[PDB]
Amino acid sequence: ADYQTIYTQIQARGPHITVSGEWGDNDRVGKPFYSYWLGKIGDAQIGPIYLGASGIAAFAFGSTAILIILFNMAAEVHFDPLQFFRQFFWLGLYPPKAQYGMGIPPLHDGGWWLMAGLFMTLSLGSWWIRVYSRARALGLGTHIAWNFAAAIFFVLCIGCIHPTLVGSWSEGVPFGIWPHIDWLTAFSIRYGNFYYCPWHGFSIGFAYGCGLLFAAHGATILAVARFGGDREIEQITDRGTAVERAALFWRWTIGFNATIESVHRWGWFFSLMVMVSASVGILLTGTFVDNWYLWCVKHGAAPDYPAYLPATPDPASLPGAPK
Amino acid sequence: ALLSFERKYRVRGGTLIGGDLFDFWVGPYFVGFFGVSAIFFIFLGVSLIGYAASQGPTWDPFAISINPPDLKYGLGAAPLLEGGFWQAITVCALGAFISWMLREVEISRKLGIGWHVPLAFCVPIFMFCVLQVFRPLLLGSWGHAFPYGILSHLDWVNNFGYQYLNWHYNPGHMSSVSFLFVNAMALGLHGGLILSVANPGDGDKVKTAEHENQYFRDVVGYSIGALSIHRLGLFLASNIFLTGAFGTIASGPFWTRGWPEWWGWWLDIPFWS
Amino acid sequence: CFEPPPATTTQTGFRGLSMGEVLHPATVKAKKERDAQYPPALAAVKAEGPPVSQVYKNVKVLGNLTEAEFLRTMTAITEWVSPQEGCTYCHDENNLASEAKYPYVVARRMLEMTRAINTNWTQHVAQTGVTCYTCHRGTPLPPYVRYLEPTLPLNNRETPTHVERVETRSGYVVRLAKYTAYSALNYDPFTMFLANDKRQVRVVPQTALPLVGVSRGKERRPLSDAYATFALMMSISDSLGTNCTFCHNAQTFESWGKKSTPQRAIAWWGIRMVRDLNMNYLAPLNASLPASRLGRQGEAPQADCRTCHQGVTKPLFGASRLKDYPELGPIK
Amino acid sequence: MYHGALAQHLDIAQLVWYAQWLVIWTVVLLYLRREDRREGYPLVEPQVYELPYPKTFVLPHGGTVTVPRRRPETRELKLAQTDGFEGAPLQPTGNPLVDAVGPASYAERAEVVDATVDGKAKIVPLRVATDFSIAEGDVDPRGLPVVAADGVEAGTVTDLWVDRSEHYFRYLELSVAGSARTALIPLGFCDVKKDKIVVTSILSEQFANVPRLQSRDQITLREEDKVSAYYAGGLLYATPERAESLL
Ligand code: BCB
Ligand code: BCB
Ligand code: BCB
Ligand SMILES: C/C=C1/c2cc3[nH]c4c(c3C)C(=O)[C@H](C(=O)OC)c4c3nc(cc4[nH]c(cc(n2)[C@@H]1C)c(C(C)=O)c4C)[C@@H](C)[C@@H]3CCC(=O)OC/C=C(/C)CCC[C@H](C)CCC[C@@H](C)CCCC(C)C
Ligand SMILES: C/C=C1/c2cc3[nH]c4c(c3C)C(=O)[C@H](C(=O)OC)c4c3nc(cc4[nH]c(cc(n2)[C@@H]1C)c(C(C)=O)c4C)[C@@H](C)[C@@H]3CCC(=O)OC/C=C(\C)CCC[C@H](C)CCC[C@@H](C)CCCC(C)C
Ligand code: HEC
Ligand code: HEC
Ligand code: HEC
Ligand code: HEC
Ligand SMILES: CC(C)=CCC/C(C)=C/C=C/C(C)=C/C=C/C(C)=C/C=C\C=C(C)\C=C\C=C(/C)CC/C=C(\C)CCCC(C)C
Ligand SMILES: CCCCCCCC/C=C\CCCCCCCC(=O)OC[C@H](O)CO
Ligand SMILES: COC1=C(OC)C(=O)C(CC=C(C)C)=C(C)C1=O
Ligand SMILES: COC1=C(OC)C(=O)C(CC=C(C)C)=C(C)C1=O
Ligand SMILES: CCCCCCCCCCCC[N+](C)(C)[O-]
Ligand SMILES: CCCCCCCCCCCC[N+](C)(C)[O-]
Ligand SMILES: [Fe+2]
């Protein structure tokens, strides 16, 4: 066994490294501190952290959203603090229950929801600038920011773009532990079973795919740690035995292989395509498709099964049947 | 038919069974004993799917569904057409999967690398066994297993969830979903980070391990490190199914009500009721 | 937090669809024992004599019955509804034709209602039918009733905590939750769907593509309808002690034919029956009941699925007294 | 009915279904599978059209590499075709541990010392990196014996080599008993106990022929490969019956 793949047997300590960027060196804040127990399974150093304006803007905007959500949740239990702690998972901030269309809802029936949504959006946009700009400051590509952008686009699709396209704020995702979960079933029911949305399928293929790829890739690199396989940058610019052994492992198993660079492109693409496929599914839902099951039936794609208990006619359709 | 660096690695050895009787390659593929047994179990399995398909309505491989038996057959054997095919095919499926796992061990040993990949591959084989073998044993019928059709298997997942009113409140499921989400995110960040360093753009220079650590210290105040992100990724992916398995096993044998009602242990504590 | 095996399982769909019931035997056993308390039918009597319509002075419903028969009805009604207080629950000793006690006039309306169930709602109750006992279970107040706002406990024979009481505003979310099988769904499906016939339970379009003129802005039903229908379905499921697959193939909740069991069509008749009971027999009794029996909006207690079923797919596991008491209907 | 009719009224979702599949098969076959072929292609004895133009990297400390590297493979006389069938395993001509073939193979990595961001040597002994220590709580292995596969003590730990970029120990240095020489061992091959270092990968006598560094206080990328590969060779070749089945 390579015990090093499980944990660090002997931890190193040394002076804290700082890589200078084009800007912002003065907005780094805190003294680094080391953690013996973290050091067993990862790097021991916690801190420092960069602030900047995008950082502070994001915390200001985020905190505002959380306070609006928490205050409306406290109101739902009439500010009893014990009931608040008990019922927390069941408490939420809801979009409008009535149909105001794109009408700005009153505060008691969706107005706070729309406030909380706006501040969360400005929080995400500020964080996106932080993720993008830190990459540029250190002379790195912007691959992370474009992945992050797909995730943000998806939250925008379920949060305001879909509601806008069908013309009702009532279709938005409530804030809350169980309430946001309840929306998944309401939305699937309203649109005729999300299992029959092909973009739900694509999204799940890529998500399952991300599990397959990170298990495979994580395990491949631990399997060649003995040969410095974790030093993936210099294995890109100067192929070592680590990534030769890795490539041949996969070539001999499945009959083809990536490079230590290209497998990261596979990883990045599969991750991105979870969010892109999901977004395309939501854009089509309610705009161009009302019932996903009946859409599959219309295209010959839906399976049928024999009766087991007798087929049951719609009573609504029988002669002399009440409303 | 060889990679430019491959020849020096193509030596005899590392097999678990058969000595060098099966110690060879066909094109890029290593064989071994388990390569032969994989092909056996795959050939049986595909034959049975073809035989079953031919006895059924259609040849459209998206409408094909080989289903388990009715519940009344319990753990007994069923007529071929009424779930016998399903039973034969499950055995061949396990045969092929276990063969494939052990083949990866022989390949690992020949290259003198860790066995981490075949060990990781045991996780999905376990979860398949939970769905098709362990949970049906505990409920007393093979009929509780999922059917072999591309679309039909989604209708089984669907009805199984709604047998517990809202499957989303299943605590094992909440854990399983959390790992699936954080894993897909982590793989994006890791993939994106490596590409960002090797490809800064505009004929600028490749960056360093020091730049990797600095990037994440800046953005979230911590960098786990190059080796550790690989161990973490195997950990997050593996835990999708290791936590998921308790949620599936519990549904029927250890819990018969809706999953929301399970949270009664918290909600109905006397002192705040 | 768990229930030990074995579990009892049934099949309600084609093999490999995972459709069917899931039952803890201890829980089935406890309900069977509760429901076994159903008093036996009283010994039958030959129809000797004239009809009580021309013997007794104030019989408006059971007038065609014979003196021995009628007294047999009255002894059944008494053990079913008011065994403790006896005949004097509804009657002045000094005059058995006197309507002076509030329970007498309600009881007459309850006879009309029980006969209307067993006659006009055979599509739901079939040849099993109902007695006074089905709902009342030996008490004047039935143990499972609904007001126009959610109340706890569900069983009115259990004592409320401070937080369960309808006046404690902080317990509302928990009152709502325990009516919807502990879901967080923010809707009262009794007042929305069962108190009257104003709202439609169906929300899912019956076309692949969105119809023009129902699919944009103020012309489309809000998503809150889907949520409300889901909360009714959670309530209906827990009321019968079953799950969605007893009635539906989840492949298409909106489809009949092979995609629904016969139990789903029976449930559809059940929704129509409850609305009839509530609108035309139970809501209007608020004018005949004391204030101590009314809710905070002056409403009479009304019926949901649980009122009869009390956590079983068939009330009292299909126990019938229909052939024992033909005067409770059906009436030709 | 009509010859050539299908039962499909076209809608937007159906259109976007075909387009999505097109985008997926395009990215995989024509971009991802092209990137996959930057190392080891073109293929050899004893593809062409679907290979991309070689890629050029600007290294951190000056210079450029173009991939794939044109450096040739050097351990080709050290293996022999037993058989005429291309699938047949190749047979070593000498001692494969020393000849460095099969799992003892190093890659033709560059004879340069890996560097920190600021141009120092990255992997160096603690006698050089005097600002680096072992964390309070862990075994200082300096002084401890190294026990090989055969139970024999093969040498004593003299130092640890730290990665200065990542703050992570990567090698132990031991004096070999019965020689006037040092050997590096990758920590991945080391079971670190309180009173000893256990090495199951090779026997005691086999530490004699661990690849030697050109220099005492720094190591090249090719040397790191040479050292690491030797011990991995041990897994299959330290004894005759390690390359046999468990039949
Ligand atoms: C607990 C719930 C389960 C579930 C729920 C589920 C959902 C909700 C959805 C899927 C979907 C899919 N599932 Mg499924 N599933 C599948 C396979 C599949 C694929 C047909 C598809 C995409 C999966 C994917 O890309 O993964 C990642 C792997 C990748 C990317 C590598 C490539 C794999 C390749 C595409 C798979 C092809 C398999 C073959 C069609 C089957 C073998 C044929 C034989 C004769 C050679 C297999 C082989 C198994 C087994 C053996 O256990 C399985 C178990 C389960 N699925 C459980 C029962 N699955 C999606 C779909 O679109 O179905 C229509 C989908 O939406
Ligand atoms: C009955 C209900 C169903 C349902 C309803 C459903 C709906 C309605 C939708 C999905 C969607 C999806 N479903 Mg699905 N589903 C899935 C899997 C999936 C996902 C792969 C996919 C994408 C969602 C995602 O990644 O969100 C995780 C990632 C997110 C949410 C991005 C967040 C990023 C953000 C930047 C984070 C920032 C957070 C801030 C820091 C916090 C600050 C907050 C404060 C300020 C308040 C599986 C594997 C199964 C199985 C096995 O059965 C299944 C069954 C069902 N789904 C049922 C059929 N599902 C989505 C989809 O693909 O539609 C086509 C979708 O919209
Ligand atoms: C209405 C129904 C619900 C439902 C019902 C459900 C059930 C019943 C179960 C899950 C489970 C799970 N659900 Mg889930 N679900 C999930 C996510 C998930 C998964 C993380 C998890 C595990 C999946 C699994 O077992 O794969 C299994 C995959 C396997 C076994 C793959 C094996 C592969 C094999 C070894 C190799 C096969 C090789 C190929 C044949 C080769 C051929 C390819 C080529 C080479 C030829 C999300 C993200 C959502 C959302 C967003 O709402 C959701 C909603 C729902 N789920 C609905 C609410 N879900 C499972 C779980 O863990 O629950 C706790 C589970 O049992
Ligand atoms: C397939 C693609 C995947 C994907 C991809 C990516 N995801 C990324 C990136 C990429 C590429 C980044 O680059 C970025 C990042 O940086 O990585 C470290 C990021 C992120 N993904 C997060 C969460 C996440 N991703 C999810 C999903 C997927 N992601 C999908 C699966 C999910 C799910 C599944 O739900 C979650 C929950 C955050 C950690 C982070 C955004 C932080 C933010 O935008 O900040 C908002 C900023 C805040 C500061 C607000 C919150 C803090 C408050 C103030 C705390 C204090 C409260 C206090 C004031 C109240 C007290 C009051 C009183 C008592 C006194
Ligand atoms: C948490 C851990 C994750 C994980 C991990 C890992 N995953 C790995 C490894 C690791 C480490 C490997 O090393 C191995 C591999 O080589 O990588 C390329 C592998 C693999 N993961 C595959 C599929 C896969 N992974 C999934 C999930 C996860 N993976 C989870 C997420 C999922 C889903 C559904 O999510 C799918 C579909 C294959 C491509 C491959 C096995 C090939 C095989 O075994 O060949 C041998 C078998 C055949 C070639 C065919 C057998 C035909 C049988 C007899 C007849 C049909 C059987 C019947 C069941 C069909 C009905 C289908 C119906 C439902 C429609
Ligand atoms: C309320 C639940 C009742 C209880 C308990 C008992 N009786 Fe009753 N009784 C009730 C009603 C509503 C009526 C009128 C029925 C109708 O068809 O309109 C009656 C009627 C009688 C009569 C006839 C009296 C008359 O009109 O002259 C008798 C003799 C009678 N009831 C007797 C009786 C006895 C003996 C009871 C205890 C065994 C008893 N009743 C209980 C309502 C209720
Ligand atoms: C469920 C579908 C019912 C059946 C069948 C019967 N009753 Fe009923 N009853 C029901 C409700 C919801 C209520 C209102 C709550 C209340 O307790 O008032 C009642 C009421 C009565 C009463 C008044 C009791 C009181 O308030 O003190 C009486 C006397 C009564 N019901 C009698 C009765 C008889 C005799 C029945 C069989 C013929 C009968 N009920 C059937 C619900 C249901
Ligand atoms: C029988 C005892 C049922 C159980 C259990 C569940 N449902 Fe149901 N459902 C039932 C009926 C009779 C009806 C139709 C009511 C009417 O008046 O038309 C429904 C309706 C639905 C719908 C809406 C369908 C539509 O056409 O729009 C949905 C979405 C639905 N049911 C879902 C559902 C779920 C999720 C259940 C378990 C929680 C469930 N139902 C149980 C009968 C029965
Ligand atoms: C008392 C007046 C009842 C009320 C209120 C409801 N139900 Fe009912 N139900 C009742 C009886 C006496 C019977 C038995 C008929 C029989 O088949 O024995 C039933 C039956 C059903 C069934 C069928 C059960 C099965 O076939 O196994 C279902 C699915 C059902 N009932 C559902 C249902 C719902 C959803 C109700 C609220 C809207 C409801 N019932 C009310 C008596 C009474
Ligand atoms: C026209 C005008 C004026 C404005 C336009 C408005 C606009 C653009 C609105 C957009 C609204 C959007 C995008 C809404 C999206 C809502 C979504 C997706 C909600 C999803 C989930 C919510 C959840 C999980 C809420 C949980 C709430 C709590 C836990 C209470 C607070 C505590 C926390 C957030 C900490 C939990 C920790 C967790 C984040 C890991
Ligand atoms: C109902 C509609 C939903 C359908 C379900 C969605 C399936 C998942 C999607 C994409 C996976 C892409 C798979 C990529 C696998 C690689 C194949 C390959 O690389 O080909 C090898 C060839 O030898 C090279 O030369
Ligand atoms: C496991 O269950 C738990 C809850 O509900 C189910 C909580 O509400 C809470 C309270 C949470 C907050 C944020 C106040 C905790 C801590 C918890 O552990
Ligand atoms: C080489 O790869 C990586 C790291 O090492 C420098 C990280 O620190 C991290 C950051 C990890 C955390 C927990 C912030 C990621 C995602 C990564 O991919
Ligand atoms: C969420 C806490 C972070 C811990 C993650 C790392 C744990 C490693 C120890 C057990 C798993 C070891 N592994 C992956 C080689 O099997
Ligand atoms: C999507 C809208 C974004 C919100 C705008 C507020 C964020 C402020 C960002 C400051 C800019 C940082 N800096 C110095 C790198 O330019
Ligand atoms: Fe990596």
Author numbering:
A (entry chain MMM): 1 to 323
B (entry chain LLL): 1 to 273
C (entry chain CCC): 1 to 332
D (entry chain HHH): 1 to 46, 58 to 258
List sentences quoted exactly from the publication behind this structure:
The RC from Blastochloris viridis (RC vir ) was the first membrane-protein structure to be solved by X-ray crystallography and has been extensively used as a model protein for studying the light-driven charge-transfer reactions of photosynthesis. Subunits L and M of RC vir each contain five transmembrane helices that form a heterodimer supporting four bacteriochlorophyll cofactors, two pheophytins, a nonhaem iron and a tightly bound menaquinone arranged about an axis of twofold pseudosymmetry. The transmembrane domain of RC vir is capped on the periplasmic side by the single transmembrane helix-containing subunit H and is capped on the cytoplasmic side by the cytochrome subunit C, which contains four haem cofactors.
We therefore incorporate ubiquinone 1 (UQ1) and ubiquinone 2 (UQ2) into the crystallization matrix to replace the native ubiquinone 9 that is lost during purification. Data were collected from seeded crystals on the BL3 beamline of SACLA, Japan in November 2018. Interestingly, although the crystal seeds were derived from crystals grown in space group P43212 using vapour-diffusion crystallization protocols, the LCP crystals grew in space group P21212, which is the same as earlier crystals grown in an LSP matrix. Internal difference-matrix analysis of the position of the Cα atoms shows that the structure does not cluster closely with other earlier structures, not even LSP structures solved in P21212, with an average difference in internal Cα distances of 0.35 Å relative to all other structures. In contrast with previous LSP structures, in which the native ubiquinone competed unsuccessfully with monoolein, UQ1 or UQ2 were doped into the monoolein in our crystallization condition and yielded high occupancy in the QB pocket. Specifically, the ubiquinone binds within a hydrophobic pocket sandwiched between Phe89M and Trp263L.
